[PDB]
Amino acid sequence: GPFPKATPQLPNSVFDMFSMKGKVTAITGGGGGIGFAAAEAIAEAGGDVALLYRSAPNMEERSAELAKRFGVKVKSYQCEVTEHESVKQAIEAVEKDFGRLDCYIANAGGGVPGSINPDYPLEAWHKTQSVNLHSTFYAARECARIFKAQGSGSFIATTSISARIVNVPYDQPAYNSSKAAVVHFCRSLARDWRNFARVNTISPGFFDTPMGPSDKAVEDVLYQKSVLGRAGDVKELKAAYLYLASNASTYTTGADLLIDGGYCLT
Amino acid sequence: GPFPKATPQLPNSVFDMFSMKGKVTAITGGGGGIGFAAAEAIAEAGGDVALLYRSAPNMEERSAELAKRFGVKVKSYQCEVTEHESVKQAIEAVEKDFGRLDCYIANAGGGVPGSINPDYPLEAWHKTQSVNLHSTFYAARECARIFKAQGSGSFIATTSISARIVNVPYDQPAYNSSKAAVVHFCRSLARDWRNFARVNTISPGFFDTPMGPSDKAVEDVLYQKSVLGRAGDVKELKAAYLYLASNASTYTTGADLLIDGGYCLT
Amino acid sequence: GPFPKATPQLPNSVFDMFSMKGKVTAITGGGGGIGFAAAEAIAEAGGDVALLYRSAPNMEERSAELAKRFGVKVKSYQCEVTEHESVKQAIEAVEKDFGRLDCYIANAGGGVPGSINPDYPLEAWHKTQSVNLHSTFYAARECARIFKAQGSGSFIATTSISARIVNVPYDQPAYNSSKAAVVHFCRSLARDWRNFARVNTISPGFFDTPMGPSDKAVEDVLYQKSVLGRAGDVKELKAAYLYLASNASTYTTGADLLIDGGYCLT
Amino acid sequence: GPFPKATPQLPNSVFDMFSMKGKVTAITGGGGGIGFAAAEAIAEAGGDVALLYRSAPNMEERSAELAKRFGVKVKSYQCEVTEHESVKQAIEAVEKDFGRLDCYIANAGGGVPGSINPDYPLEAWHKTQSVNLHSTFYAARECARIFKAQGSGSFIATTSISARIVNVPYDQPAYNSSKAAVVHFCRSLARDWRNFARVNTISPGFFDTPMGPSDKAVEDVLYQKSVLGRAGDVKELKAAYLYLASNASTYTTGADLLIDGGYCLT
Ligand SMILES: NC(=O)C1=CN([C@@H]2O[C@H](COP(=O)(O)OP(=O)(O)OC[C@H]3O[C@@H](n4cnc5c(N)ncnc54)[C@H](OP(=O)(O)O)[C@@H]3O)[C@@H](O)[C@H]2O)C=CC1
Ligand SMILES: NC(=O)C1=CN([C@@H]2O[C@H](COP(=O)(O)OP(=O)(O)OC[C@H]3O[C@@H](n4cnc5c(N)ncnc54)[C@H](OP(=O)(O)O)[C@@H]3O)[C@@H](O)[C@H]2O)C=CC1
Ligand SMILES: NC(=O)C1=CN([C@@H]2O[C@H](COP(=O)(O)OP(=O)(O)OC[C@H]3O[C@@H](n4cnc5c(N)ncnc54)[C@H](OP(=O)(O)O)[C@@H]3O)[C@@H](O)[C@H]2O)C=CC1
Ligand SMILES: NC(=O)C1=CN([C@@H]2O[C@H](COP(=O)(O)OP(=O)(O)OC[C@H]3O[C@@H](n4cnc5c(N)ncnc54)[C@H](OP(=O)(O)O)[C@@H]3O)[C@@H](O)[C@H]2O)C=CC1
């Protein structure tokens, strides 16, 4: 269009920039460590939250608790992120029940570790790519229509240090490549969607979660590589999700927030 | 050690993590666009602010206004950042006056554009390195002592997109290299101050300040490179400075926050 | 077992380091611009070459021309890279016909451009990931066995500037993702395969092949962004492939060679 | 509209691309491990070489021996890279004695290690910056004139993994930041000089030279971080320097060749 494009009117108050009042956020892996923490940050900011889950229990009860706690709307939705159909239906259910969708957090993830050789099953590769990469694309694709119609939107993917670093001692090229794919996929989206949305990623290091250090051997690697000598606590991501989800970050697009206690420094 | 290092207690509330109450932040370039915006964010979070300036007028008046606005202590200090003695003295004055120093924001910057050839004065090169790079080292060196004695601290340097990309059409290798040096200097400090401080950088794209686009030619490059088709407003750096300065970001260290409206996506 | 690992015995002659005498190289996209250029480089260096193609015509005669021109063995193999069985069968045919496999160049690529939209078919996404990413995984999976049996190998993937920047004016997140994925997949393999092989990528900018600038609007961007103001000529990639394929690069692993005429600088 | 710019004269033979016959290369740190290896690669390719040294003994003999060995012209020059006049004096002498200057390799380096705190002398910071960063600027400044007159040139800086990662266990933010500075300074020159020169860097990991692993604690870090479990041998750099100095790399500008045995992967 004509240049320069309009600078938005912006709150004089930094805390007001963080407000999620009147805004709707959907979060996959909603029942998990990072996902629920993000939900708590956003619910505290006054935002309504859709918690998307697959196998997590008590989600209706956990939703009701979060809603009561913060005085916002929280509803849980079953969503199998490897299935486009399920990803789409969850998004359209959120749009229908809430009236809009301002933020999608593609936070569900997983995969299967292993060296690359003929002992690595072909399905292990594709399940891994499906859960981290294809899932993000299925969500983005459908969000694109909502965000374009609203003229606004914020897409966040939870990536990993594995997108830029190679995990040791348990090789996992599949998971590493799938997360790197997401990082640059989101960057491409930031340009693609420049007229109606921002797109950013958060790359956590090791966090105290069921997806954190699997055993003593990875813990020992963590204590050496993390300059802080410890795994993160999920509260330490809360502000970063809220930062990207809100008007705190209206000039932040195509960015990857590295929250890793210095893991990637050495 | 031992390992794991202890987690740091954090409030249950995401907004309480941003609180700067009881904490002291010193900010060079404190009379300037980005530096005063940062000061406003920190004062809003209840933090005390030392405003470090060189030639900016009415700093005593502007400091008192900010103090009254937010109900915090604000005091200005003359500091020439290319002189280690001036940098050291301002740091020691704030330490003496406020009793502590929790966050130093190495935000002052400048330099001289020009192609690298025999018409580029040696002093231009050295003034540019002094104002961006040496200044930061001078600050870090004296902050190290205070942070180590406190066992806590947050060091922030304002870098630039110029640390990772090359500006056009006006060549400025000196400025670009000086900002790249600061980004990795800071990354080096994050490992080095491990036991007592976090250190991070904020890399703005072009912002509407006296250091924003030189002329129409730079403007035209910005309008097509930035996917948002405009320069930033310093309000949109505010939340990022507070993020890093506070307990919002306790597992964030060695990071470079890119806030560039997509300039670097390409 | 113990450290340090043995330093390889190497020629005093730098030109001898480039020799591909007694080495077998397999190259997907072998009938294409970049792939045949690399074949010419390796044939000249005295290497035997397996040319892997899908639809390219006259491959038996082109192979014959190359073999005669350079006095090496050259054979063509039909290989559809989106299918694991065809990738594996080609690799195993080469191993049998040539007796060994020293270097594999995962050079075939493609994809479907387009904005991420409900108008972007799921099939287009998966076709794009298949030809660039899955293909590379399928080759690597099978090479791992040969390479470790041998105690040596060099895996090379042709990536793109699209791995690290986003292409304009024609959005293509699928392709950009898939190439980013390959870059870090190869980095993960470099660690994975550390005892028996080296793994590196070459990321070309725009080159004059059928995969080069698709129209005048892409050309105009290229002229602005490449500091050299032109597309590459495939001869300008030849040395980089020979460098990685040979003993010229025995301490080079996990690297991404950017050959882009400065496309990524600004 | 002089776009597109003509593609240079490109040898059809990959080995002819590496030829340095009729080309003059000046190498600081010429008496050192990497520098002399670079000189041998370039002498073998038929290039004339100026060995620039500060304190290295027997340089007149070592030059004469390299010249006789390869049948090229080799001369030595006393050059203190921290002083602009000495850098310029050596450049102008080379130009006068050899007639030309096609390639400058800013290879000299050093510095003083240490944590950043009041015990790190201001002089130590400035020495470190001078030897790595300012030296490179001093060379570039004067090379620009020669390259402009020639319409051609290849500027190479020897950087380090330290430009991209943080060394451990012995902190060295000064050295790290200076090297990072040089990487992006070079990237900036690649654009600046785009009409008459190419500009690239080579980032070695630890190599077996007096600037290699200082003690067994560094060695132990090296053996666990580099996937090849050993320090580099200087022969393993030769081909990379030749690659950048010659027509092997005519579309390669603004690139950083990482040659680190995978040190930066994990
Ligand atoms: N913790 C760590 O050390 C790190 C984590 N990450 C990333 O953070 C994200 C969240 O993980 P985290 O909270 O740590 O761990 P959790 O195990 O607590 O959460 C992971 C979530 O992924 C969901 N999930 C997995 N597969 C599917 C699927 N097929 N369909 C729908 N949901 C699925 C799970 O849902 P459910 O339980 O309902 O089945 C679960 O809630 C992941 O993307 C992970 O890759 C990145 C770096 C580090
Ligand atoms: N605006 C932009 O587009 C971008 C700016 N930046 C960086 O942001 C930072 C702040 O600049 P910004 O706020 O935009 O512009 P301003 O011009 O408003 O601020 C620049 C500040 O630097 C101070 N300064 C310059 N030289 C010295 C010196 N020798 N000693 C002490 N102070 C000095 C000035 O202080 P005083 O007036 O008191 O002399 C001034 O406050 C700089 O580091 C700049 O490099 C990075 C990317 C983009
Ligand atoms: N040219 C450019 O500007 C750039 C190209 N690249 C990459 O370089 C590589 C080579 O392309 P380039 O030489 O430029 O272009 P070409 O079109 O000349 O060659 C591309 C090759 O890809 C092969 N191919 C495509 N799909 C398949 C498939 N499904 N199975 C087997 N082979 C397949 C084609 O084989 P066939 O014809 O036999 O069917 C063809 O030989 C690609 O990976 C591309 O992504 C990267 C950056 C820039
Ligand atoms: N070896 C390694 O592990 C690594 C080395 N590097 C870099 O490689 C480059 C070469 O080092 P390398 O060959 O390994 O080690 P050497 O010690 O063999 O070489 C270092 C060279 O730098 C020269 N030098 C130092 N200070 C000055 C000065 N003030 N003026 C002129 N010359 C000076 C020395 O010259 P003289 O003897 O004549 O005084 C010497 O030839 C350096 O830039 C270093 O930073 C980068 C990564 C790793």
Residue numbers in the entry:
A (entry chain C), B (entry chain A), C (entry chain D), D (entry chain B): 7 to 272
From the manuscript:
Recently, for the production of (R)-3-quinuclidinol, 3-quinuclidinone reductase (RrQR) was isolated from Rhodotorula rubra. Based on the amino acid similarity, RrQR belongs to the short-chain dehydrogenase/reductase family. Therefore, RrQR possesses a novel mechanism for the stereospecific reaction led by a characteristic interaction, in which the hydrophobicity of I167 and F212 plays a crucial role in the stereospecific reduction of 3-quinuclidinone.
The crystal structure of RrQR was determined at 2.2-Å resolution and refined to a crystallographic R-factor of 0.192 and Rfree of 0.230. A clear electron density for NADPH is observed in each protomer, and the structures of the four NADPH molecules in the asymmetric unit exhibit similar conformations. The crystal structure of RrQR shows a tightly associated homotetramer. Like other SDR family proteins, the RrQR protomer can be divided into two domains: the core and small lobe structures. The bound NADPH is in an extended conformation, and the nicotinamide and adenine rings are about 10.5 Å apart. Among these residues, R60 and S61 form hydrogen bonds with the 2′-phosphate group of the NADPH; these bonds are involved in the discrimination of NADPH from NADH. In this reductase, residues N138, S166, Y181, and K185 correspond to the catalytic tetrad. A small space is found above the B-face of the nicotinamide ring, and is assumed to be the substrate-binding site.
